[PDB]
């Protein structure tokens, strides 16, 4: 199964610096070239910074111009991307993609479509990060998510068993800078005495998992 | 540098319509083009490389085209299964660049809201808080207005909404509605109703 | 009644006798013979491909050498594996600097780029590799070596240490050692106007029939791939 995971999202306020890392697996790592591209939550697609098959040829964008950093290591099959004096707009989803091409180019022609990316993780530019506050609620249920704060963030239900006829709402920006999101499911009238549901919630920067029953 | 801008931005189309985008490059680009999928909330997938080689393994019905200054992309046939964003992007020389995007939305359904009323938990009254629920789900339109009342009283600005978008099985847009309060406020009025523009009802503390 | 060849390639437009000698792409082409042969250029002069350090080696005259040759064709075919060579694995180096008519990429098809997989880092230990006699009947055996050499901290990005490279070869009784250079490298000149830290010195090697080739080489070098096999003599003037 061919995998790109990202890791090392959370928080971090202006002007910091971070490591980012990319995991590869199944196939050559060796052979093809890597890009990074950046994406703010619902909006278009800018990119980062690519880099050849080899460490012998780097390029960056004009927006992280001397700020980030590209490497990788093809022995230890891992990508990583650092990054320097974060500014308030890099604030975005960032996403580890490999290219299609295997041409070991060396020159400044080197780059070409994706063909694979991993899911991102996002990048967030400063107060402390909140745990979230769960609630429950044909008939119909759900649950929500209120009061915290980093917009990383999924619900499962039944430990993942149900994903048909379930709608997973965005997070919603209160006046208080909090996120907040609810996700509910349609069910039959009969389901409330025969299946116990459940809803699974995780937050990863406060290490925060709270799974409640209605 | 390069910069790419697309055309249409918003497309709605009806089902199994022919629906077409173009991409047109800043300065010139020979046949240096790619183009991708992306749903909301999941990673991007690509379609078309290198102006109009399919990629293996996506269905046969897309297809694009291009050359020199002016490049096309294409649907030929619409499955509900189609709906995202779609970019272009080039590699040619420096900095790749993406267009501002297009996204894409369907324009063949009426189905009606089902529509459903949660009271808040005991167990967020316990913090000193509370938070209704005015839910919308499956419905096409998405052009829709949905107010609240507590008692007859217009709640204003103290309401919050989400895009709940709609999911690729010939279904639509939904909604939900969250109202914000306070504990005080809260137990100072007995009905709570959202009206849609049918309303349903219930009462603080009854079953 | 006879005829001459002053271009070693006819159809080879845009190619000077150096371009098509050192096997740039887009200028390999049929390179027939001709008796009477027109020396032309008292400096054979480049344009294209990866910079070369023209002076550090003898390879100016190569193809005033060939000219004095009757019949001229490249090698058919590849001389070693080059990714199976001694030393590690090796990745067939490729260059944008050295376009070709389908893409921007490309490399000389007489000498390889050799590049050691990232799971090279390692205290190293001198190499050899041979280097057949692959050309028919009479048909002399002129095999085309190098090796590359970039900055003090790109060597390092691409190799185990900053530290130069040793190479030497020797066939025909005649043996010649070479050591890379690090930084402050000439004017890039006979290039295609790309910037380039890296510089390529390029030498050759002659091998009468059935003579063995030997290469001794370090990290960094360009081993062949197609080879000149050249017979009988061409009246020169
Ligand atoms: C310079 O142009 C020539 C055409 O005039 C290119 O010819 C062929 O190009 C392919 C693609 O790079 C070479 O690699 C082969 O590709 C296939 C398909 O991916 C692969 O299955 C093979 O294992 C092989 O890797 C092919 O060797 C090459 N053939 C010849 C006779 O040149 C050439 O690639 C261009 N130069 C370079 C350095 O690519």
Redesign the pocket.
Known sequence: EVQLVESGGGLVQPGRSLRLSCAASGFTFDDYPMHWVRQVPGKGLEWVSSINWNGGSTDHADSVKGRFTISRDNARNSLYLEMNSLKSEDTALYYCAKDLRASSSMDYYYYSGMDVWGQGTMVTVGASTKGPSVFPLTAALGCLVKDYFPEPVTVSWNSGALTSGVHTFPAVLQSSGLYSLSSVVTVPSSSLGTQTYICNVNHKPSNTKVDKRV | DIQMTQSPSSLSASVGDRVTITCQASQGINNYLNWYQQKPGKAPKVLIYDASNLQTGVPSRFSGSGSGTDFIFTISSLKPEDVATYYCQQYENVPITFGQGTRLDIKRTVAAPSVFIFPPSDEQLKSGTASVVCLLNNFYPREAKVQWKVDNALQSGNSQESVTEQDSKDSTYSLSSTLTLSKADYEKHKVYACEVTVTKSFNRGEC | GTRTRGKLCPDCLNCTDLDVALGR?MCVGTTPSAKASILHEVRPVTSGCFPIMHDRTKIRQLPNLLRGYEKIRLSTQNVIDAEKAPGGPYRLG?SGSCP???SK???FATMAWAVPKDNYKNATNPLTVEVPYICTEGEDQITVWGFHSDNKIQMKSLYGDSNPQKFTSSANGVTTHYVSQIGDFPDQTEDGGLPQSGRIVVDYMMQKPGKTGTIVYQRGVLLPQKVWCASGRSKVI
């Open positions: 792409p490729t070709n008519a389908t990429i490309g490399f």
